[PDB]
Design a protein around this nucleic acid. Sequence first.
RNA 1: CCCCCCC
RNA 2: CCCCCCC
RNA 3: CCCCCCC
RNA 4: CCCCCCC
RNA 5: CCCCCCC
Lengths: 378, 378, 378, 378, 378
Amino acid sequence: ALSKVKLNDTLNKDQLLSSSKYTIQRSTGDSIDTPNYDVQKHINKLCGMLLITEDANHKFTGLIGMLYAMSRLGREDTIKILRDAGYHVKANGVDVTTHRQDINGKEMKFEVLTLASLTTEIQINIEIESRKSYKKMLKEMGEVAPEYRHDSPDCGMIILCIAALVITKLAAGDRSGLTAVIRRANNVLKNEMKRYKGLLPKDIANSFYEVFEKHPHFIDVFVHFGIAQSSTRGGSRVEGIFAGLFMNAYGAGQVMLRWGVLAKSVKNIMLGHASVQAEMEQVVEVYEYAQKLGGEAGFYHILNNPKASLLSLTQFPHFSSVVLGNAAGLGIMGEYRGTPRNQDLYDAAKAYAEQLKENGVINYSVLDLTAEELEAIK
Amino acid sequence: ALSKVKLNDTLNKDQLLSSSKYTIQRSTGDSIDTPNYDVQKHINKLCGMLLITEDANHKFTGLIGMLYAMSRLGREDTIKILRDAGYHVKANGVDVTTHRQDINGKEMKFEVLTLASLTTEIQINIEIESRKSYKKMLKEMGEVAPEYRHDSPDCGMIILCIAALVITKLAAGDRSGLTAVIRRANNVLKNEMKRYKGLLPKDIANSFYEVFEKHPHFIDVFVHFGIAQSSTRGGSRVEGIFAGLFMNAYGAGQVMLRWGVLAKSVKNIMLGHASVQAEMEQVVEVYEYAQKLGGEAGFYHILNNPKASLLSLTQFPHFSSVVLGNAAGLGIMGEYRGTPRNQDLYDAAKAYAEQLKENGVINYSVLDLTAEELEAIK
Amino acid sequence: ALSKVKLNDTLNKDQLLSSSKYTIQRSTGDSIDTPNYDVQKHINKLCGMLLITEDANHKFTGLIGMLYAMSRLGREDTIKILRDAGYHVKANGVDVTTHRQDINGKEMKFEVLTLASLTTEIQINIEIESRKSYKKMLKEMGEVAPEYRHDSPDCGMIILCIAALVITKLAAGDRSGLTAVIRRANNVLKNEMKRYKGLLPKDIANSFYEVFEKHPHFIDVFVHFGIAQSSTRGGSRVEGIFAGLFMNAYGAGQVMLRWGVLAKSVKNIMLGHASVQAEMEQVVEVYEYAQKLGGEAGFYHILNNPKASLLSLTQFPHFSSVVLGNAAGLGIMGEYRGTPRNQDLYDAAKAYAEQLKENGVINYSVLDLTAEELEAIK
Amino acid sequence: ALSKVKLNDTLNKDQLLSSSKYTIQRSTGDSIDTPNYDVQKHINKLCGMLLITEDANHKFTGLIGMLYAMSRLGREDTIKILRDAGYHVKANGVDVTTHRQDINGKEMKFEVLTLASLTTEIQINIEIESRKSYKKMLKEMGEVAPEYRHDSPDCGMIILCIAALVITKLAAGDRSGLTAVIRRANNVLKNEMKRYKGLLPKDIANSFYEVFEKHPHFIDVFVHFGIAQSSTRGGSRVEGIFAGLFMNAYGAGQVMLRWGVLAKSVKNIMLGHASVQAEMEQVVEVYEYAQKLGGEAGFYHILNNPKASLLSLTQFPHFSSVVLGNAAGLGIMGEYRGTPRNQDLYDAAKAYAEQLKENGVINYSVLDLTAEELEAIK
Amino acid sequence: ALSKVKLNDTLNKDQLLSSSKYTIQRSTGDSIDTPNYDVQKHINKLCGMLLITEDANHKFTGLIGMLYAMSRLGREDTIKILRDAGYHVKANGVDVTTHRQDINGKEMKFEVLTLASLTTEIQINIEIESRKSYKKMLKEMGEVAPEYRHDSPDCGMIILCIAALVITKLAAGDRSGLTAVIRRANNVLKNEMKRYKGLLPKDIANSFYEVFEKHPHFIDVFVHFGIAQSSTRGGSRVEGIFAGLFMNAYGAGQVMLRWGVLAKSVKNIMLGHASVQAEMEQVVEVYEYAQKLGGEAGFYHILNNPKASLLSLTQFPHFSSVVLGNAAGLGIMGEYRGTPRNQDLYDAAKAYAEQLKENGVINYSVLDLTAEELEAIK
RNA sequence: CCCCCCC
RNA sequence: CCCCCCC
RNA sequence: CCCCCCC
RNA sequence: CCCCCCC
RNA sequence: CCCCCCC
C-alpha cells in the first residue's frame, strides 16, 4: 500500500558505484620511487638527519616522510596500494649507492639513495648542514647524547606524527587547519620538541600540505599505512603517539553524524518535531549505511572517496539544523563554520540545549540505591 | 477469482524491451578518436592551456573534454562502451607528432596531437594564445606559481565539472538550463574561477551543449565515465568536486518519484483519497520496478534511455496531482514548469501541505525518555 | 465432480496455433530493397532533403522511412525478420553510385542510390527541390545554420516518429486516425516543425498509411525495428521521442484489458454481480494467458497477429459491458465507438462510477496517523 | 476402497479406434493440382479477376480459392497433408504457360495456368470478363484506383474468408447454413463488398459448398491451411480477418461442451440432481479427454475424424438435458434445433435459468469491499 | 504389513487361460467365400438391387452383406482375421463372371458371381426382381433420381448399418432384441426407408441373426470389420451412421460394470455396508483387470472370448445386488431381466436411489459462493 | 470476426 | 510522448 | 556538491 | 447414432 | 455358470 512507496536512494547509489564494470586508471606521471624494507634504515637516518639540523629548509620533508611510510609499507605493498587506487605506476626500485663529492677542497664519502624526485646534491647538502649542526652542538653542550642524536628509530614516526596532524586537518581541504596543526604540534611532541631542536611545525606542516596537494595518491598511500600501523600489536611510545594521533582522523568531516547521535543521547526535545520526523526515515537510512560501511566509514573524507557524500546529513536541512543547534547549545560547536539551513529549528534547539545543561536533576533510576540516604543526609 | 484479474504493464514492457532478439546499430559518421592512456598527460596540458588563456575562445573545449574522458576510460574501454551502446565506429588511434610552422617570420616547433575531429592548426592557435596570455600574466605579476600555470593535474576535471553541470541540466533538453549551470558554476569552484582567468561557465557550457547535441554517443561515453570515475577509492579535490557534481544527476528527470516518497514521509492527507488509492497499485509497481533496477535507474533520463518512460508518474494523474500539490505546499518546487493534471487534488493537497509547514507539534513519543519531568517542562 | 468440467479454451487455441507443423509462405512481389549499415548515412540524408524542401511531394516518403528502418536494422537482420515472418523476398542489395542528369543545359553530378522500388530520377528531383529550398532559405535569412539543413542526424527519426504515431493509430483499420495523428504530430515535434519547413504531418501520415496498406510486410519490419530501437542503452532526444511515441502502441486494440484492471481497482460494485461472476472464471483465464504471453502481447493488434482475438473481452458481454460502463463513468472513454452488449449493466455501472468520481472520503486507514488531531483543528 | 472402482471408457474407445493396426487407404480419383509457392501470384491475380468482374461466373471460384490455399501451403506440404489424411493423390505439378487465343477476330496473348481441373478456355473467359468489367468501370467512373483492381495482394484472402464462413457453418453439413453465411458475409467485409463489385456471398458460398462436397480432401487441406495461416506472426488486415473468422470454427459441432462449462459457471442448481450426479463421472471423463486432446479437439467435427463421437454429451441424456435447458433458459441458443432427451429436467433447468437472468444480488464479499465505510454506504 | 496378503485371483485366472499349453483347434467345415477388392463393386450393386425391390426376399441378404464386408476388408486381411481368430478355412476366391440365361424367350446378359453358398440362379432372380421393381416404380412416378437407384455406393452400408444394430443387440443371443433392432432402425435410417422401399429391418435383422448363428465366424469377421470401418477418416453419411451405430456395440454384455461406476457416482449408501466392504477388494481387482485390458475389454462378450467371464460382477452377489438395485432405483434399468442375488441389499439400495431422485445435492465449493441465502432459497 | 478513446 | 525545481 | 570545531 | 445457435 | 435395458 503506502509502505512499499520507498526509493532507497543512498543504498542504490552505493550499488551503482560499487558495481560499475568499467574501471578507469589515472596517470600519475613518469614513476614513483618505491623503496623496499632494506632502505628503511637509511630513510630513518635521513629523517633523523632532517630533525637534527637547525632551521633547515624543510620544504622537501613531506616527500621524505612519504618515502618512509611507503618503505615500511613495502615494494609489493605500495604497488598493490597504487593498483587498488587506480593508477599507472612503474615500480622505480630504490637502492643504496655511495657518491664521493669534493666540497670546499675536501672530498669525502657520503651515501646516496636513488630517487627520481630527490637528487644526490640535496642529500649531500642536508648532510653538510647536519654536520654543521652536529659540530655546533658538540661545541655548545660538549657531548651529544644517544637520545639527542639522529640515530633514534623514532624520527620517521615523529615526522609522520606531524603528518598525521596535517592529514587530520586536511578534511576541510582549503589550507585553513595550519594554525590548528601548529597548536597540536606544540602541545603534542613536547619532549621531541625539546630534544630534537630541528622540529619546525610550520615547515613540516607546509611541506606535507604541498606534497599532499600536488600528489593525491600519496594521501591514499599514507591512509592505508596509518590503518596498517594502527593494527599492529605493539610499538614504541612514539609509534603509540602516532597511532593515537591518526585515529583522530577517523570520522574527519563526518562530525554531523556524531553530533546527531549525541543529540539522540542528550535527548533534545525537538527531535520529535514534525519536520524532523519527516526526514527521520532517510536519517536512519544514512546511519544504517554508515554502520554497514563499518571500518573505513571514517576515512571517506580524508581521501576524497566519492562515496563520501553518501554520508552527509546536510541534505536534510531540518534534521541538520536541529542537530547543529543542539550541538551549539551544549557548547560543543566551536567556530564551526557550518550554517543551519532551517533557522527556526536551529534557534529553538539551541535555546533548549542552553537550558538543559544548567538544569538536571539526580536521576534516581541511574542511582542504584533503594533507600534515599541523601534524604537521610538532608 | 477477482484477485487474479491483473495486468502487469511496466514489467511486461521491460520484458519485451530488454529481451529483443534483433539489434540495430546506428552509424555515427566517419570515426571517433579513442585515445589511450598515453595521451592523457598531453590532454591535461591542453586543458591547462585552455584555462590559462585569457578570455579564451572555448568553443572547441567540449571536444577536448570528451577526449579527456575517453582517455581516462582507455582505448579498449571506450571501444567497449560504444560497442555496447550500439554504434559503428573504428578504433582511431591517437598519437603525438611535432609540427614546425614558421609564423610571423620566426619558426617555432610545437607538440601536436593527431586527431580526426580536431585539427592541428586550431591546436597551434590554442598554444600560441596560451603563450600570449602567459607572457601577459608574467608581465602583470612577475612570477607564475605552479598553481597559476597549465601544468596542473586537474584542468581536465575542471572542464568535466562544468560538463557535469551541463549533464545535470540537460534534463530540460532545450538549452533552458544554461542560467542554472552558470549560477552553479559560479557558486561551485570559486577558487578555480578566481585562479584561471579563462574559466568562462557560459562558453564552456555552450560548447558542451553543442558537443552533446551533435554527437549523441558522447553523452553515453560521458555518463559511463562518470559512473566509473565516482567509484575509485581515491581522488584529488577536483575529482572530488566532479564526483559531487555528477551525483547530482542521479535522479535527473525523476524528481517526481522522490517527491512521492516525500509525500509518504510527511504523511500527506490526500494520499488516502479514494481516487488516489485507485492508482496506489500501479504506483507501488513503479516504485518496485525502480528498486529492482536499482543502480542505473537514475541515469535513464540523462541518457535518453528508452526504458526511461517506465519510471514516469505522469501516467497517474491523481497521484501525480496530489504529489505535485504536496511539493507546492511545502514550497520545495521553485518553478518546476510541469503542471498538475487534477486541479482539485492539487489545490486541496497544496492547502493541507501549507497547513503542515506552519503547524507542527513536538511529538514527545519520538523521544524515548522515561523521565516524567517532561510534563513539568510542558 | 464439477471442478474438472473446465474446458481450457484459450490455452488450447494457443497450443493449436503455436504447435502446427505446417508453415505457409507468402510472396511479396518483385523484391524488397534491404540496405546494409553502410547506406544509413545517405538514407538519413535523403530524409533530410525531404524535410528541408518547401511543401515537398511527400507521397514518396513512406517508402523512404521504411528503407531507413531496414538500413538501421541491417541486411541480415531484416532478411532474418522476413524469413521468420514467412515471406519470400530476395535480398536486393543497395549501394551508392553516381548518376548524372543534364537539366537546364548544365550537366550535374548527383549522388544516387540504386534501388528497385526507387528510381534514379526520383532521387534527382528530390535533390533539385532541396537545392531550390536551400537557395530560397539562403536568400531570405542570409545564412543557413547546420540545424537548418538536411545533414542533421534527426531527420530520419522525425519521419519515423510520424510513422510511430500512424502505427499507434492504425489499430482502427479504417484510416480514421489521421486527425489524431495530425494533432499528436503538432503537439509533439513542435521544435522540428518550427525548424524544418517541410514537415507536413498530413502528407507524411497519408504516405505512411499507403505504404503500410499496400505492403503488409513493412508493418512487421517496422514493429520489430521499433522494439529493437527502444532497447538501445542511449541515443539522441529525437530517438527518445521515437521510443516514447512507439511505446504508446504497446496496448493498441487492447484497451478493454486495461479498463478491466481499472474497474477492479476502483472496486466497481457490479463486478460482484451474478451475471459477471459467471464470466469471471474465463476472464481470469484470459488475463493469465495475457500474462503468460508477457512481452509481445501488446503488439498483436498492430501486427495483425492471428493470436490477437484470444485477448478480446468482447466474448464476455457481461464483463465487457460492466467494464465499459465503469470506464464511461470515470470519463476515461472519450469517443470510444464501442457499444456495450448489456445495456442494463453498462448504465448501472456507469451510474455507480459517477457516484465514485465526485464523492470520495479521505481514508485515514491508509495513512498511519496515530492521532487524528486535525479534526479538532478543523 | 472404491476410489479405484472406475472403468475409464472414453479412453478405452479412444485407443480402440486409434490403435487398430488396420489403416485402410481409399482410392480418391485422378489427382489434385498442388502448385508450389511460385503460382501464388497468378492465383491471387485470378481471384482478383473473379472479384472485379461484374456479376462474375463464380461457379468455378471455389476451386480457385482452394488452389490458392494449396499454393500458400506449398507442393511438398500439401502432399504431406494429403498423405497424413490418407489419400491416393499424385502431385500434379502446376506451371505457367502462354496460350494465344483468337477471339472476336483478334488474337491476344494471355497468361494461362496449366491445370487439369481448370482448363485454358474458361480461364480466358474469366480474363475477358475482367477486361469488360474494367473497361466498364473506367468508362463509368473515370479512373479506378489500384485498390479497386485485381492486383491487390488480398483478393484470394477475401475468397478464402467466405470459405471460412462456409466451413464454420458446415457443421450441419447440408447447406443449411447459407442464410448465416450470407448474413455474416454482409456484416463482415462491408468495405470489400463496397469496392470489389463481383463479391456475391451467395455465389461464392454455394461454390465452396459444392467444392467441399465434391472433393472431401479439400476440407482437410483447408482446415490445415487455416491452422497454418493462424500461426504467422503478422500480416495484412484481410489475413487477420480470415484468421479471426477461422477461429470461429474451432468448436464446431461441440457447442454442448462449452454450454456445459457455462452451466457449471452460472451455478445452475440441477447440476446437483440425482440423475445428473449419476453420470457426472462419465461427463468429467469426457471433459478430461477433451483437455488431454487439447489443440485439435475442436476440429474433429469439421473433419470426419473417426473419434468425433467420443466428445458428445448427447449420450448422457440427463446432463445433456440440463445443459441444453440452461442454454435455452439464458437465451444463448437462438434457434439451436437440438432437442433435449429428458424433458422434465430440461424444463426445470430452463425455468431456474430464467429465474437467474432477472434476479441476481450483488456479492459484496467477492468484491473486495473490506472497508466497512464503503460497505455501509452501499 | 497386511497389505502383503492379497491373492489376486482374476489376474491369475487370466494368466492361466492365456498361458495354457494345450490349445485344441477347430475345423470350420468346407470353406467360406472371401472376395477381394474387385468384387466390392458388384456386391454393392447387388445390395442396391435388394434395396430398390419392394418387399424383396431378404432370406439371403445377410450373407450378401457379410460378403460385402469381406470384399471391403480384402482377401489377405479377411484371411488374417480368420487365422488370428483360430479358424481352419481355405480362401475360396470369388470372381466376376458372366452368365447368359435365356428367360421367357429372351436371352439377357448378366454378370454373375461364383459363390459356394450363393448360387447363380438365386442372384439372377434377385437381378430380375430388381428390374421388375424398377419397372413398377418408374411407371408409378415417372422419373427416378440418381440417389434413388442401385448404383448408390452406400446400399451395402445401409445393410451393414442394420447389421451394426444386430451386433449391438446380439448380447442376449436368443433373438430377443429384434424389437429393439426394429425401433432403432426406424428412428435411425428414416430417410433410407423413405427412399429404398426394400428396407424391412424385421427381415434383414432376422437374416443377420441367421447368418451370425449359422456361421459363428462371421461375427468375428464383422466385429473386426466394424472396428476397421470406424477408423477410416473419410466417409459419406451412411458410413458415418455405420461408425456411430457400431461404437454402440462397444461394451456389450458388460452393463454391470458401467452401472457399478454409476452407483459409485451417486454415492449410494449401501456401498458402505459391511458385506459390500468385504468384497470391495475383489471388485477393484475386476475393475483394474478391465482397465488393463482396455481396448478389447468391450468386445469380449460379442465375440465368444474365453476370458470374458472374468469381467462379471455377478460373482459378487452383494456388490452386484447393490449396483443393480441402485440402477433400477434411478430408473435407468429398463426391461433388464437379470434378477438380483441378494434381495435385501437390492431393495434397500433401490429405495435409497429413488429417495435421491427427489432431492438436490449442493456442489458450490468449487467456485466462490457465500451460500447462506444462495442455499435453500434456490 | 477483432478493432475503435486520450496520451 | 517523457522531461522541467534548488542543490 | 560535500567539507569546516576540539583532543 | 452424431451434428444443428449467435458471433 | 455368464449374458439380458436405452441410445
